[PDB]
Paper text:
One of the key proteins in long-term synaptic plasticity and memory is the activity-regulated cytoskeleton-associated protein (Arc). Drosophila has two isoforms of Arc, dArc1 and dArc2, with low sequence similarity to mammalian Arc, but lacking a large N-terminal domain. Both dArc isoforms are related to the Ty3/gypsy retrotransposon capsid, consisting of N- and C-terminal lobes. As opposed to the corresponding mammalian Arc lobe domains, which are monomeric, the dArc lobes were all oligomeric in solution, indicating a strong propensity for homophilic interactions.
Residue numbers in the entry:
A (entry chain B): 4 to 88
B (entry chain A): 5 to 88
């Protein structure tokens, strides 16, 4: 297969692209996060991993400290995308 | 210190060419410790940084053969002593 350490390398090499939507990015990251050992990380941690990997428009507009879940994060990210076409 | 920036630093800080294992692990353990106490076990902290090492350490030290940083330092010193 593929060992935990290589997954972390993939997670942190998988940054959001300049035209990639938040729904796409979180799907991608959550799939990798699921290849990790079941029970290791809570959602707060999984959010910490990836928050800095989002594209700049989302980090400027969505303070990490205002989000507690992937649902809360997706909702604001879609909100971000729906205001600039 | 916001956990997500620490993680971004951890994985932005790969071991450089000719940087010895003590130098690299020092650096990372400093970052690993800025995280909330108790979040990660040592098995996880090794997984974080293991892929960040240079090829000679990974080529010679299988991740599955170390359980602690001390075991990692000891083999990493051995790798460096093979060329001294």
């Amino acid at each position: 297969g593929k060992p935990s350490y290589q997954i972390y390398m993939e997670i942190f090499e998988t940054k959001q692209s300049y035209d990639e939507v938040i729904d796409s990015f979180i799907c991608k990251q959550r799939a990798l996060l699921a290849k990790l050992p079941e029970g290791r990380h809570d959602e707060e941690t999984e959010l910490d991993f990836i928050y800095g990997l989002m594209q700049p428009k989302y980090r400027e507009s969505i303070p990490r400290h205002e989000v507690k879940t992937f649902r809360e994060l997706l909702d604001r990210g879609r909100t971000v995308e729906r205001t600039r076409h």
